[PDB]
Amino acid sequence: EKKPAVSVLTMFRYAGWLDRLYMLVGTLAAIIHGVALPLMMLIFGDMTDSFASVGNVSKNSTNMSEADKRAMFAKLEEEMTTYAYYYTGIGAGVLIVAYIQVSFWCLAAGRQIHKIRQKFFHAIMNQEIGWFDVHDVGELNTRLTDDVSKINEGIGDKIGMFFQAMATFFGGFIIGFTRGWKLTLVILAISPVLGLSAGIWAKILSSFTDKELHAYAKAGAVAEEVLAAIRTVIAFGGQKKELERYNNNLEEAKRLGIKKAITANISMGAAFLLIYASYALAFWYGTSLVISKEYSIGQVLTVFFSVLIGAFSVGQASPNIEAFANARGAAYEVFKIIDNKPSIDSFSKSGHKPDNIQGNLEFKNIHFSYPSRKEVQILKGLNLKVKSGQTVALVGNSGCGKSTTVQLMQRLYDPLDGMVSIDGQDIRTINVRYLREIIGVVSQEPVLFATTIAENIRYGREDVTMDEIEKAVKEANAYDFIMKLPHQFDTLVGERGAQLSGGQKQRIAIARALVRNPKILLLDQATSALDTESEAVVQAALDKAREGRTTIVIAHRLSTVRNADVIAGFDGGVIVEQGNHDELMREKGIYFKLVMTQTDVPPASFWRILKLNSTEWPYFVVGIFCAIINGGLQPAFSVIFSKVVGVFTNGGPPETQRQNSNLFSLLFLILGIISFITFFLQGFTFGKAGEILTKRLRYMVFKSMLRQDVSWFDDPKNTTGALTTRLANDAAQVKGATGSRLAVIFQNIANLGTGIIISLIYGWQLTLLLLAIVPIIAIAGVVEMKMLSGQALKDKKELEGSGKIATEAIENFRTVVSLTREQKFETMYAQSLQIPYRNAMKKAHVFGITFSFTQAMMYFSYAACFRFGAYLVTQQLMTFENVLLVFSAIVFGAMAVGQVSSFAPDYAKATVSASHIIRIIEKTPEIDSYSTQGLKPNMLEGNVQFSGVVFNYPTRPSIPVLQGLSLEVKKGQTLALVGSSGCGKSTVVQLLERFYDPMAGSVFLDGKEIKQLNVQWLRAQLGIVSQEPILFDCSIAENIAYGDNSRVVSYEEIVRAAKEANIHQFIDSLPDKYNTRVGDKGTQLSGGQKQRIAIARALVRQPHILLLDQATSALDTESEKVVQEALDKAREGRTCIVIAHRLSTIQNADLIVVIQNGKVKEHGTHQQLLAQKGIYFSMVSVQAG
C-alpha cells in the first residue's frame, strides 16, 4: 500500500509571514537547547580531571600535613566555583531558550489550523451535488476533525523537538570527535549492530500482531452474530451451543498471543544486552587509552556519553518524523478538496439576475444520466413547456425521472443534451443563487434544523420581522398548533428538541419556503409520507401556496392531481401522452390504468483482579524472582561504573589499574548476560500467565453474558457492538494488571530500595539532598503529563459545538443548498471557533513554561549536587568515588522506574478495563436460564392462563403496558390477539416465553406458576415465530436443527417437517439441496422464503404451543399465501396464539381478545364480536372501506 502525501514546502502554505518568523526564531532556540546537554558532558569530564588530579595526591604520599590539605583542597574549592557557575549558566539559558522553542512552534501551528478549518469547511459547502453523490459523507465529516487533528500534531511543537534532537545528534558526535576520535569510531562501529537489532524486532513484533487480529476475527465473528440474534438464542436454549463455537475458535489467538509475548521480551533483553555489551567494549578499550597516558579520566567520560546521547537522539526523533509524515498524508485528502473547483458554483457571481420573472418553463430535448450510474440513461428526448401561472403534475411508472425534472430545474445537475430555459433564457446563463432565491422547494421528507421555529423559518431569508413570519405560518396552516406549543414561536425543534408530527414539520417547511416569496414552486411528494388525516391540512396549504405561481408537483394522491391545468405522462424518459385528465382518461392509456386502481466509574481492588490469575501462581513466583534480580542489576552497574572511576580518581598503584579496570569492565557483561536471562524468563512465565488469562476470561464473560436476562440486552448500553469490544480487547487488556504489575513493583522496589541503602552508608549527607530533590523533579514529569492531558479535554470539548454545527450542515446538504444558506453555516462555524482559538493562543504560553521550568530545575539542580558533593571532598568527609556511587545510584536508578513504567501497559486503562469484566461476570440474573431445577412434568395438556398480569418494561420503567390483564386459552384452541397498535399484544408472548417476569399478577400453565417451572423446559415446549426471522450464516440443516438442540436430527425427521412447512418441493429443485450455505455468503434468500424456514424449525420440535407475533410483515404477495398455507397446517390441533395485524386470519380462530390500555375490553368468536358492534367491529370496517 502506497498512500500519497504533500510536498513539504506546500504544506506550510496558509502560514503568514509572522508564522514564518516564529518557526525560525523557535528553531534557533531548539538548536541551542539541543547542544546544551553535550556541553553539560564536556564540563562533567573536565570536572573529574580536576578531582582526579588531586584525589590521589593527598592520599598516597604524606609529604605535608596541612600544607598539602589546604594546598590541594583550597584549589578544588576555587575550581568548583567555576564548574558550578558554568552549570548554572546553562539552566539560565535553557529557561529562556526552551520557552521560545515550544512557544513559537505551537503558536505558528495554531494560527495555521484556524485558517485551515474555515477554508476546508467552505470547500465542502462549495461542492456540487453530484460531488456528494459519489462520496461517503460519514468519513468526510470525521475527516473535518480527525484529519485536521492529524495535521496539528505534525506542525506544532513536534518540530521544535526534532531540530533539538538533530542538534544533539551533531552536537554530540562533534564533541566526541574533537576531544578524542579513537573512542568514537569504536562506538559508531557498534551502533550499526544496534540500529539493525532495533529495527529487526519491530518487524517481527508487527508480524505476530496482524496475525493475532486475524485469529480472534473468527471468534469475534461468532460473538457478533449471537448477540444480534440473541432473541432467537434464548428462545431455543442454544446458550451453550453458541458458547462452544465461540470457544473452539478462541484457542487460535492464544497460541499466537504467546509467540508475541515471548518474542517481545526477547526483543527487550536482546537489546538490553547489547547496551551492557557495548558498554564494556567501550570501557575496556577506554581504560587502555588512559593507562598509556593519552586520555585522562575526564576525557573518556565526556566522549562516551557525548556519543550515546547523540546516538540515542535518533530514537527520540523517530516519532516526531512519523507524526510529521502522518500530517503530510492527512493534509493531502484535505488540500485536494480546497483546491477542487466546481462547474456549478453556488458561490460565484457570474450570470444575469433578471427581474420581473414570468416563469415560462421550457424543457428542450433533455437527455440525462446520473453520475453515480452513468451507464443507465434516465431521460431520452424529453420536451415540455409550463406556461406562466399554470400547474403541472408529472405522472408515470416507478422511476427517478419525475424527480430528475425537479432536480434539473433547481440546476443541481447539468443535462447531457438539450437545454432548460426560463422565459427563453438558458438556466446555465443566470446566477445560481438568484435562480434558487426565486425558487422554493418542498421535498418529500422535511428537514428541520435544531434551532427555534423562528430560526428554522429565518433560514429562508435572514432579514425578517416577526410580523412577516406570522403571515407565512398562517398561510402554511401551522399557526394554531404553534400557539398551542409550550414556548410558542420559541419552542425548539430538530433532533435535540420537542418532536413535531410529520404534518406539522411540512407546514413549517412550507412556511420556510413562503418567506422566500419565490416565483416558481417545485414539490416532490410533499404528501407521500402522510396518512389521509394529516394530508388534508397539508394539501389545503399546498393548494394555497400554488396560487399565481408556476408549479410542477410530483403527486402521490391522485385526487390532489385533478385540479391541475395539465398532466404529463412519462414512460422511459419520454412524454407519451399530454393533456387534461379527461383527455388521458379518454386515451385509455397509461394514466387511465393508474387512476382506476386507487379508487462508568467503578474502582476495582488491586487484590480482586490478582485473584483471577491465581490458578497459575507458579508462573507468578518465578516472574517475581526475576523481577527482583533485574531490579538489582541497576545499583550493581552504579558500583561497577563507580569502582572503575574510583581507581582513576581516589588513588592506586598503576600495577593494579589493569586488573581492577578489566575486571569491572567485564562485570558489565556479567550484568549484561543476567539482563538477557531474567527477561527471557520473566516474559515466559508472566507471558503465558497473561495469554492464559485472556482466553479464560473471554470464555467466562461470554458464558456469563448468555446467562443474563433480556432486560440487560434491551439496555441502551449493552448493544451488540459494545459487548464485542468488552469481550475482545477489554477482556485481554486485564493482563497488564496481574503479572506485569508485580514485575514493575518488584523491580521498582528492588531498584530504589537497595540503591537508597547503599548511598546512605557510603555517604549520607549527599543522599538526603538527592532523595529530597528526586521527589521534586519526579513530580514535575507527572503534572506535565496531567496538564498536557487535562488541557486536552478543555480545547477539544469546546470544539464539539464547532463540529456539531458542521454535522448539521453536511447531514442535510441537499436541503441547505436549496435554501442557499451555505454562507450562514460557514459564519456559524467560524464564530464558534473563536473560543478554541483564543484558548490555544494562551496554551502555548503555558506549555512554553512547563517545558522551560522542567529543564531549568534539572540543569540548576545538577549544580546543587556536584557542588555539595564537592564540598564533601574539600572537607575530607567523603571521596570523589563515593559521590559517583551516590549520584549514579539514585539518579540512574530513579531514571530506571520511568524506563520501566513507560514500557509496561497503561495500568489505569487496564484496571477500569478489568473492573468492567468482573461486573459482567459477577452479575446473577433474575431469570437463571442456565438452571437445572423446576418441575418439568409429563403433563402435555397446555391450558394457558393469564390472571391479573401487571407489567412494565424496566428499560422504560415509567410506561405502563399491562394492568390487570386476564385471559385463558383452552387446550387445542387458537386465540387471536387484536387491539390498537401497542406492545400489550406482543408482551403476552414474551411473558409466556418468560423473557421477563411480571411485576404483579400471575401467568399459569395447567394451573401451575411458571416461576416454579424449569426455564429451559418451559421454553422447550414453546415454538416462537418472530416477525423478521433471523437466519445464521450456516447450512439449512443447522438453521432448522437449531430449534431442537441436544438431539439426533435425521434426514427422515427434517424432511417431514419441511413437507408440513410446505417448502419440501422448493428445496428439491435448487442446487446442492439441503446443504446450501445461507446468508450473504451463500445464495441470498427472499423475504418470503425465510419465514417459511422459521415455521419448519418450530414444527420439528412438535411443541404443544405455537406463538405467532406479527408474522407476514412483508410485501411478497405470492409468498404471503404460501405462508398462510403452511400456517394453517402448522396450527392444526395445537394451542396457538396469533398476533394478527391483518384481519382475515382471525375469522377461523377459536377466540379473539381485543386489548386496550392493558385491559381486555371484549372477547369471543369472530361472529360474536362483530354482532356486538363494539371495538372489533370498528377495526374490521376499516378494511372494507
Curated annotation (Swiss-Prot):
Coiled coil: none
UniProt topological domain (Extracellular) ranges: 40-85, 178-184, 286-299, 642-665, 763, 867-882
Membrane topology label: Multi-pass membrane protein
Enzyme Commission number, as recorded: 7.6.2.2, 7.6.2.1
Protein name as it appears in the record: ATP-dependent translocase ABCB1
Transmembrane segments: 17-39, 86-106, 156-177, 185-205, 264-285, 300-321, 621-641, 666-686, 742-762, 764-783, 844-866, 883-904
Residues annotated for ATP 1 binding in this entry: 396-403
Cross-referenced PROSITE patterns: ABC_TM1F, ABC_TRANSPORTER_1, ABC_TRANSPORTER_2
Family membership noted in the UniProt record: Belongs to the ABC transporter superfamily. ABCB family. Multidrug resistance exporter (TC 3.A.1.201) subfamily.
Additional information: In mouse the MDR gene family includes three or more related but distinct cellular genes.
CDD domains per the UniProt record, alphabetical: ABC_6TM_Pgp_ABCB1, ABC_MTABC3_MDL1_MDL2
Class of enzymatic activity (EC top level): translocase
Pfam families: ABC_membrane (PF00664), ABC_tran (PF00005)
Record key words, sorted: ATP-binding, Cell membrane, Cytoplasm, Glycoprotein, Membrane, Nucleotide-binding, Phosphoprotein, Repeat, Translocase, Transmembrane, Transmembrane helix, Transport
Function according to Swiss-Prot or TrEMBL: Translocates drugs and phospholipids across the membrane. Catalyzes the flop of phospholipids from the cytoplasmic to the exoplasmic leaflet of the apical membrane. Participates mainly to the flop of phosphatidylcholine, phosphatidylethanolamine, beta-D-glucosylceramides and sphingomyelins. Energy-dependent efflux pump responsible for decreased drug accumulation in multidrug-resistant cells.
GO molecular function, one term: xenobiotic transmembrane transporter activity
Ranges for domain ABC transporter: 361-597, 944-1182
Cytoplasmic side, ranges: 107-155, 206-263, 322-620, 687-741, 784-843, 905-1185
Chief place of localization: membrane
One GO term of the biological process aspect: response to quercetin
One of the record's GO cellular component terms: brush border membrane
Regulation acting on activity, per entry: Translocase activity is inhibited by verapamil and is sensitive to energy depletion. C1orf115 regulates drug efflux through modulation of ABCB1 localization and activity.
Catalyzed reactions: ATP + H2O + xenobioticSide 1 = ADP + phosphate + xenobioticSide 2; ATP + H2O + phospholipidSide 1 = ADP + phosphate + phospholipidSide 2; a 1,2-diacyl-sn-glycero-3-phosphoethanolamine(in) + ATP + H2O = a 1,2-diacyl-sn-glycero-3-phosphoethanolamine(out) + ADP + phosphate + H(+); a 1,2-diacyl-sn-glycero-3-phosphocholine(out) + ATP + H2O = a 1,2-diacyl-sn-glycero-3-phosphocholine(in) + ADP + phosphate + H(+)
Superkingdom of source: Eukaryota
Binding site residues for ATP 2: 979-986
Source organism: Mus musculus (Mouse)
Subunit-level organization: Interacts with PSMB5.
